[PDB]
Write a protein that binds this ligand. Structure first.
Ligand SMILES: [Mg+2]
Ligand SMILES: [Mg+2]
Ligand SMILES: [Mg+2]
Length: 90
RNA sequence: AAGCGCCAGAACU
RNA sequence: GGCACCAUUGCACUCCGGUGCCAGUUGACGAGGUGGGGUUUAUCGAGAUUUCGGCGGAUGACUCCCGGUUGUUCAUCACAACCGCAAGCUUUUACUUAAAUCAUUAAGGUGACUUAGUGGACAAAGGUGAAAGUGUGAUGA
């Protein structure tokens, strides 16, 4: 069910990797400390983010609050990650 | 201190 | 990389779906070379991914020209090779710091890459000394 890492989609695909990476860090910093934000632009991974929190407590509040939030003209879609990330697992 | 200087093809961001 | 257009709403942790376009970055490593006029695809090695491809520069080669060596001192003249601040040809000999690639580890980059440093080597042609070997003729002292 719940996870340290959160899965975000429906992101604006037109925005470049690092700009998107640093703009997500601008909002999700309040919920807790972020370990890393993983963004790709490939066919299968575009418009998708993976914010890695240190506390699940933070990832829940981030999921609760930032659901449906218009980010770059497009509302966000947040779930928990299906499995734990490498930095969390190891 | 002239194999030296620029950069339509090409290739790699 | 970045603007668009088409496609994609997708659960990852070594990048990477197209085409059109406007910007990037790479695009020669060092030795050696200039009397004027033409003609032309301009010498020498090192590396190996492109130092490929197209474009200009140029001190190259061949040649005409003027100028001058060498062929036994010197003008005039044929010649024969040469040279443009050097100069017949042959052969050895001594100089003429090769750098890059490689390895490496920084620094600056979103990045392709960039600049710089360290260690370790290895050229070829040409030029310049030196030592033999060794190359003309008329007409004047
Ligand atoms: Mg060079
Ligand atoms: Mg040079
Ligand atoms: Mg090869």
């Amino acid at each position: 069910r719940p996870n340290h890492t959160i899965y975000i989609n429906n992101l604006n695909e037109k925005i470049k990797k690092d700009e998107l990476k640093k703009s997500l860090h601008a909002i999700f910093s309040r919920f807790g400390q972020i370990l890393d934000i993983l963004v790709s632009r490939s066919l299968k991974m575009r418009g998708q983010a993976f914010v890695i929190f240190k506390e699940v407590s933070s990832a829940t509040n981030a999921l609760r609050s930032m659901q449906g939030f218009p980010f770059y003209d497009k509302p966000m879609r947040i779930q928990y990650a299906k499995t734990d990330s490498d930095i969390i697992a190891k």
